[PDB]
């Protein structure tokens, strides 16, 4: 899995399930080109976003729709979304896990980057 | 001060000093318009970005240049920047403090929103 | 103020007000001796816990009563408390700010250490 | 797995491998009784700490030796250890994953609690 995203709920102590996100890749004109998307599973994980051959050097943005997640729980959150912007594959392929821990007024994110 | 940003360094246990950031506001055509910018002080704080009159309802993005901060310390970090996107003042004027806690592969961010 | 603690609420986007905490110092017999205690103010800050003369080298524990805070809001939280254990002043006098960002099932904590 | 601990390194973007920890359970005299222990694997995970039958209601403390982890990397960290103190199994068995994200001057922790 070249790119996986895992989302956790800090209020309820659970995976954040059915969280939608889009992934973009920065184009030469500095616009954000659509790249991948999906929703987290019952484990809070989104696998299968891309393949090693398609996932080359670039600046990538994961835009996680945290607002819809909190709204469905009756909570008015601070952020429009949580976004994670990073350069990937600049030294050749790596495997990336992006984790996000969500609260209504806060989020934390980290990356685990592994060499295949 | 209707908007203040405070940035902390989780590696060195210090304020994150001289961190550049840019604030944008979403325009009617869904474009990000430049709104304000500045650098954190010796306390890790950036004051004076805007005024009560100028800080109208809208969707704002604070883009913190974490990459340059880490690179100046000899660290090749994961993120291009740490960004915070939020609706402001849609229920009347509020004061916002955005805090960010930085590590090379991770960041946490929260908001303190107060009604004056 | 050689030691200050600041506590923030990630659910409500506010300082965590009236949060009790107890500070202990490790005794020569490896027991935790009571050192100081107090409650956060309306700003989420607790000042005046100790003095430069009293805050000698040692191992200190700050135990923040997060459980009572959440229970007063009707939330059954995960942790009994958030605690921070650290050696202080072993290279000479320093000023310490301990910050904690609270959610029902999660907390983040950092330290800002400055040389006066 | 009734109790699993996962530890991540926010400086290097990797699992925190070979991190030692002890688990204690509060006794009737308010002393901390030894309960379980181990070291994280190459995935940053420590499995097999306990069994469902042995893991009953109590207050548990996971004490993670983060200081030795940072010292081995030549880093002088803030905390003596990271500790996570929580009541478990008060409503009967649950499965607990404790995650900790480590930086030299900061840590974040969350719990994922699932009903079998
Ligand atoms: C708002 O003013 C302050 C915030 C903080 C720390 C905020 C913080 C701490 C964390 O552990 C995580 C996080 O995302 C934010 C410290 C001193 C301040 O004066
Ligand atoms: C539980 O499983 C996993 C948790 C995480 C990340 C947890 C985490 C992330 C943060 O940004 C902050 C925090 O306190 C905890 C990553 C991979 C996993 O498989
Ligand atoms: Na390269
Ligand atoms: Na309105
Ligand atoms: Na000394
Ligand atoms: Na019960």
> Secondary structure of C31-48 in the HEC alphabet?
CEEEEEEEECCCCCEECC
* Distance from the Cα of residue D23 to its chain's centroid: 7
Q: In terms of CA atoms, which chain B residue is nearest residue D14?
A: B105
Of D80, D106, D110, the CB nearest to C85: D80
Residues enclosing ligand 2, CB less than 6 A? A 6, 8, 97, 99, 101, 108-110; C 106; D 6, 8, 97, 99, 101, 108-110, 112
Residue B10 has which token pair? 């989780």
User: CB distance B110–C13 less than 8 Å?
Assistant: yes
Q: Rounded to whole angstroms, how far apart are CA atoms C16 and C12?
A: 9
Q: Give the number of other CB atoms < 10 A from CB of residue B9.
A: 24
Residue D102 has which token pair? 């480590």
Q: Rounded to whole angstroms, how far apart are CA atoms B95 and A41?
A: 37
In three-state secondary structure terms, C91 is: coil
Chains near D (3 or more Cβ pairs under 8 Å): A, B, C
DSSP state of C67: H
Chains near A (3 or more Cβ pairs under 8 Å): B, C, D
Sheet with B79-88, edge to edge strand ranges: A32-39, A20-26, A58-64, A79-88, B79-88, B58-64, B20-26, B32-39
- Are C79 and C86 spatial neighbours (Cβ–Cβ below 8 Å)? no
Task: Output the CA–CA distances (angstroms, integers) from residue B95 to B3, B56, B89, B112, in the order listed.
Answer: 6, 12, 9, 8
Give me Rg for the CA atoms of chain A.
14
Residue A53 has which token pair? 């051959």
Give chain D positions within 8 Å (CB) of A13: 110-113
User: CB distance D113–A8 less than 8 Å?
Assistant: no
- Are A110 and A96 spatial neighbours (Cβ–Cβ below 8 Å)? no
- Are A98 and A6 spatial neighbours (Cβ–Cβ below 8 Å)? yes
- Are C8 and C100 spatial neighbours (Cβ–Cβ below 8 Å)? yes
Q: In terms of CA atoms, which chain D residue is nearest residue B14?
A: D105
- Are D4 and D98 spatial neighbours (Cβ–Cβ below 8 Å)? yes
Rounded to 10 degrees, what is the CA torsion of D97, D101, D102, D103?
-170
Q: What are the two backbone dihedrals, phi and then psi, of residue D45, each rounded to the nearest 5 degrees?
A: -115, 145
**Domains contained in chain A, CATH given:** 1-116 (2.60.40.180)
Task: Output the CA–CA distances (angstroms, integers) from residue B43 to B15, B65, B74, in the order listed.
Answer: 6, 17, 22
Chain A contact probe: residue of B61, B85, B90, B102 with most A CBs at under 10 A: B85
User: CB distance D104–B11 less than 8 Å?
Assistant: yes
- Are B33 and B23 spatial neighbours (Cβ–Cβ below 8 Å)? no
Query: In angstroms, what is the span from residue B4 Cα to ligand 1's centroid?
Result: 12
User: CB distance C112–B10 less than 8 Å?
Assistant: no
User: CB distance B112–C10 less than 8 Å?
Assistant: no
Which residue among D10, D110, D111 is best mutated to probe the pocket of ligand 2, counting the most ligand atoms within 8 A of its Cβ? D110
- Are D28 and D85 spatial neighbours (Cβ–Cβ below 8 Å)? no
Q: Rounded to whole angstroms, how far apart are CA atoms B38 and B92?
A: 25
């Amino acid at each position: 899995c070249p790119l996986m995203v895992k989302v956790l709920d800090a209020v309820r102590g659970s995976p954040a399930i059915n969280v939608a996100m889009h992934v973009f890749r920065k184009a030469a004109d500095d616009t954000w080109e659509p790249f991948a998307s999906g929703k987290t599973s019952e484990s809070g994980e989104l696998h299968g976003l891309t393949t090693e051959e398609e996932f080359v050097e670039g600046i990538y943005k994961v835009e996680i729709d945290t607002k819809s997640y909190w709204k469905a729980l009756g909570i008015s959150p601070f952020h429009e979304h949580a976004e994670v912007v990073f350069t990937a594959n600049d030294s050749g392929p790596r495997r990336y896990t992006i984790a996000a821990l969500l609260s209504p007024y806060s989020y934390s994110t980290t990356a685990v980057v592994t060499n295949p």
